[PDB]
Amino acid sequence: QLTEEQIAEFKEAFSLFDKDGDGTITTKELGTVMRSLGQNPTEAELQDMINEVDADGNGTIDFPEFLTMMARKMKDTDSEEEIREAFRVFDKDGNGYISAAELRHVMTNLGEKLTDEEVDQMIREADIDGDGQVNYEEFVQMMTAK
Amino acid sequence: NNLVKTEFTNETLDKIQQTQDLLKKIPKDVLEIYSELGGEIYFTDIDLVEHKELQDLSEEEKNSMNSRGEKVPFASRFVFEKKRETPKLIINIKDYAINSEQSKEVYYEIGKGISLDIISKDKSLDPEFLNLIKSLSDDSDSSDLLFSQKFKEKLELNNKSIDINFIKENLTEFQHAFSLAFSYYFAPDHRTVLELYAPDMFEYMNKLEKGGFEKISESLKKEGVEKDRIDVLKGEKALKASGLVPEHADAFKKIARELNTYILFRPVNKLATNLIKSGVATKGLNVHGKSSDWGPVAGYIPFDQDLSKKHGQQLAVEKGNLENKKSITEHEGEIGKIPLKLDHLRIEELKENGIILKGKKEIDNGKKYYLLESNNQVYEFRISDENNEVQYKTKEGKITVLGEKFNWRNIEVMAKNVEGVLKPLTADYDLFALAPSLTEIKKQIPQKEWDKVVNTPNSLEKQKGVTNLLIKYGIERKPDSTKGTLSNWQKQMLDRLNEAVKYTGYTGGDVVNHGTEQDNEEFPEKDNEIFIINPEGEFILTKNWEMTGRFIEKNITGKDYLYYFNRSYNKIAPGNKAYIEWTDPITKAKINTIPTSAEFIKNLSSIRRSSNVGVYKDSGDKDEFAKKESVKKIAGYLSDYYNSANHIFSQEKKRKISIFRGIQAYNEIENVLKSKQIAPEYKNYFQYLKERITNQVQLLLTHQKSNIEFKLLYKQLNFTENETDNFEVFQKIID
Ligand SMILES: Nc1ncnc2c1ncn2[C@@H]1O[C@@H]2COP(=O)(O)O[C@H]2[C@H]1O
Numbered sequence A: 001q002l003t004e005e006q007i008a009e010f011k012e013a014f015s016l017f018d019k020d021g022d023g024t025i026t027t028k029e030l031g032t033v034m035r036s037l038g039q040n041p042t043e044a045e046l047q048d049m050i051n052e053v054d055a056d057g058n059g060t061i062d063f064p065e066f067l068t069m070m071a072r073k074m075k076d077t078d079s080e081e082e083i084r085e086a087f088r089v090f091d092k093d094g095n096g097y098i099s100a101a102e103l104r105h106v107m108t109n110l111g112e113k114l115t116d117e118e119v120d121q122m123i124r125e126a127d128i129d130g131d132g133q134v135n136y137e138e139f140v141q142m143m144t145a146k
Numbered sequence B: 001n002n003l004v005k006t007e008f009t010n011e012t013l014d015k016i017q018q019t020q021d022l023l024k025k026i027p028k029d030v031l032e033i034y035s036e037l038g039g040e041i042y043f044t045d046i047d048l049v050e051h052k053e054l055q056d057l058s059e060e061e062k063n064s065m066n067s068r069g070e071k072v073p074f075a076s077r078f079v080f081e082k083k084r085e086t087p088k089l090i091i092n093i094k095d096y097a098i099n100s101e102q103s104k105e106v107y108y109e110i111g112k113g114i115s116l117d118i119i120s121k122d123k124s125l126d127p128e129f130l131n132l133i134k135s136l137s138d139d140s141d142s143s144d145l146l147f148s149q150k151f152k153e154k155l156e157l158n159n160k161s162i163d164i165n166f167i168k169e170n171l172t173e174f175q176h177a178f179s180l181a182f183s184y185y186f187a188p189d190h191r192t193v194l195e196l197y198a199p200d201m202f203e204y205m206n207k208l209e210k211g212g213f214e215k216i217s218e219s220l221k222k223e224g225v226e227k228d229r230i231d232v233l234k235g236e237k238a239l240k241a242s243g244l245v246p247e248h249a250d251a252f253k254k255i256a257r258e259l260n261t262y263i264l265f266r267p268v269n270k271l272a273t274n275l276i277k278s279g280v281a282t283k284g285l286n287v288h289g290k291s292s293d294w295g296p297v298a299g300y301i302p303f304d305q306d307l308s309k310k311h312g313q314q315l316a317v318e319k320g321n322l323e324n325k326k327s328i329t330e331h332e333g334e335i336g337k338i339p340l341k342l343d344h345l346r347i348e349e350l351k352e353n354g355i356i357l358k359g360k361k362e363i364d365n366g367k368k369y370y371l372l373e374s375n376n377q378v379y380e381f382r383i384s385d386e387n388n389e390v391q392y393k394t395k396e397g398k399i400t401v402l403g404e405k406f407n408w409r410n411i412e413v414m415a416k417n418v419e420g421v422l423k424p425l426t427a428d429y430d431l432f433a434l435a436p437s438l439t440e441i442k443k444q445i446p447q448k449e450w451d452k453v454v455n456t457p458n459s460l461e462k463q464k465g466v467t468n469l470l471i472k473y474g475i476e477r478k479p480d481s482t483k484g485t486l487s488n489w490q491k492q493m494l495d496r497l498n499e500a501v502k503y504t505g506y507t508g509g510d511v512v513n514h515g516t517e518q519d520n521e522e523f524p525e526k527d528n529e530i531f532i533i534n535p536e537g538e539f540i541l542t543k544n545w546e547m548t549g550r551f552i553e554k555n556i557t558g559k560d561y562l563y564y565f566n567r568s569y570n571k572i573a574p575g576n577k578a579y580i581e582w583t584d585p586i587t588k589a590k591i592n593t594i595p596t597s598a599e600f601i602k603n604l605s606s607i608r609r610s611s612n613v614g615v616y617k618d619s620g621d622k623d624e625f626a627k628k629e630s631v632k633k634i635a636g637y638l639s640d641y642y643n644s645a646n647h648i649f650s651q652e653k654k655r656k657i658s659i660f661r662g663i664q665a666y667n668e669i670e671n672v673l674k675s676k677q678i679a680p681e682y683k684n685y686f687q688y689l690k691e692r693i694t695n696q697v698q699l700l701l702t703h704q705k706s707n708i709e710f711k712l713l714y715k716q717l718n719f720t721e722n723e724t725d726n727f728e729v730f731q732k733i734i735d
């Protein structure tokens, strides 16, 4: 049951990468359409979706072909929120960032004795832009990024 | 709060090592007594006269009682104290020495002492007998009538019993003392003078050094917080606007502790405060009637809507009754209507509160009826006598907004089903939120799961694993057949509350029927006052939506308690289409964060549905394409900023590598803003996406080397036909 608004996107994005301007996107394109939207199906998990409906040049998928396939894994998932709440939780001080200090802090109350060496560690691998701290964006990345 | 300030780092150690040789002699705590009084000590180079950047015209010299004795020659001075709000001691030193005739440093001692007397113990707490009787040792206790060095022109009065009779009049002269007693105790030279001559003041000071200064230093420290804090009326003054049934509030007082979790409730109507203790049931989710604030029915949910708050709105009622009807029409057996029966106490209550007036009697069919009067102008009411039923009817000169008119009938209230007995309904306790100790949640995860998670290698995954656990056992919220939408522990908590107010003496079942208002995403309501109950047993009722949000930040959020705020805060809530603001830190940092591919696409996808025109049209113009191709380009650059393989790099590079990715974006943006006719709707957004990048890119700079500005750094680049060495150019731009 994707909300209408949930279509605006799944198209405003679907189309942006439809180079040849028609209404069907190649495999690699679907791959891109999605990633751009914030996901990434695996190299092989990417086929099962496009594969089930071969009513094309045995390789492409149209607009509906798409919208109707964004259910298989989108008519259940509501985790997005939880994770945004988990964030506000560690971001103890409300700066919008999660500092190695608080990570280790909230980590222990929740019961985990973390080594000063393996916290300045997580915070690092989680940090993508190099500013020593993890914002909501990098957090969400780290979290869901399977 | 750093106390001492050194103005001119001009001399060598000679000056420095002199201000040190100075403070190392004053008792650390006497300083903590200063810093508390918001004081700050000022040491300077050669500023004698009114030359210091803080020695001009504020609270200067009024009445002349100045140094030890009295001299008032300011000019020549080197030590001064700005007396009026926040003490400011100012000291200058010149050449080598204070130690020959220390009779000079003494003033930096008493001159100081004038900081803590009048605020010390001499009078802050008040002159307490301690110094009130110790000052009395003028001449009566010990055989040492030696007080010549503190009592002259104001107390050469050896002929007077100095108790409370005359020590108030001149608080000042008894400061010129404590001060000279201090200067004398800590003066690097004359220490025994106050031991030989004053026999007690000495002990006095000594005790103070022994631990007295820390006394007050801790009595001003404690009133440091209790002073400036969040004005919430605590104690029982809250429980007053709380509406909760005292025995219950107190009853809850015990659960917050054991479990350790703040319980926050919304305003419970007072005209229900007793209908509860009494034994009346509470409105659950199945009922959406309106209560009443007048008449006999008041405090109950009339079945007759026109007998509630919405008395007149020919639709709140016409679509109000329409509500109760269905309430039964559907859940029959559990939700029904029963006749009103105001008991004994209740009547006497709605009395002094002024809702009804019991007066003249009447008789019909043989039964007695005391008449109940209410200054309404459409319904007349009457209770019975046998069974205290109640009845109404339209007056012989009025109608009902819907168009009805009737004779005496029994007033029907709504009533759920309690142990097979339709009990009447009044307001329920609606929880505003539940804040459990961040640890209490751990005591929620089954020892093996939390185990199988931490016994993992991957430092990164050991977090994800945890967080998800914290989420699965703490934050997650499933819906529910009966109790609204609430957490799992939230339900467990929801039980302990009800069973707790049952071993107390309640007979209407549960008094908390559904999850926390911070899930009432649909029709969220903004309550000003909010009764809270810390994990200790103190009733605190906030007073603002802010204070409330402020009290949660200070005592809950930032104090190790898991709290989560209403999903619909900051957005427009569908149902009542309402916007309720609540400080979201994530949003705080949005201003300086480069957007995400998807955050971007999304926003475009939005404006489309707004101005019915998208960034690029499906047309033949080859410029539209251009524009299209272009956004597909930014869509990348952004998506490229947030790459997970930025991890095999060094913190350093991460900033560089990303500042570029950033900049690249700011470019293709700069490219379209200077394009064909992209509507303004988009002209604006892009206008905005820039400030982001910029800020984000600026921030990534001030983390490492910050003499460089975005504007400039940009200029120096060449995004024309060759990007190759441009990055190489970028590197050298930071050295
Ligand atoms: N799970 C829930 N937690 C909190 N409030 C809820 C929940 N489910 C519904 N609500 C709404 O909270 C509202 C506040 O007052 P009402 O009793 O008039 O109606 C209530 C419901 O509409």
Ligand SMILES: [Ca+2]
Residues within 6 Å of the ligand: A018, A019, A020, A021, A022, A023, A024, A025, A026
């Ligand atoms: Ca195509």
Ligand SMILES: [Ca+2]
Residues within 6 Å of the ligand: A091, A092, A093, A094, A095, A096, A097, A098, A099, A102
């Ligand atoms: Ca932080």
Ligand SMILES: [Ca+2]
Residues within 6 Å of the ligand: A127, A128, A129, A130, A131, A132, A133, A134, A135, A138
């Ligand atoms: Ca970061």
Ligand SMILES: [Mg+2]
Residues within 6 Å of the ligand: B283, B284, B285, B428, B429, B430, B513
């Ligand atoms: Mg309710």
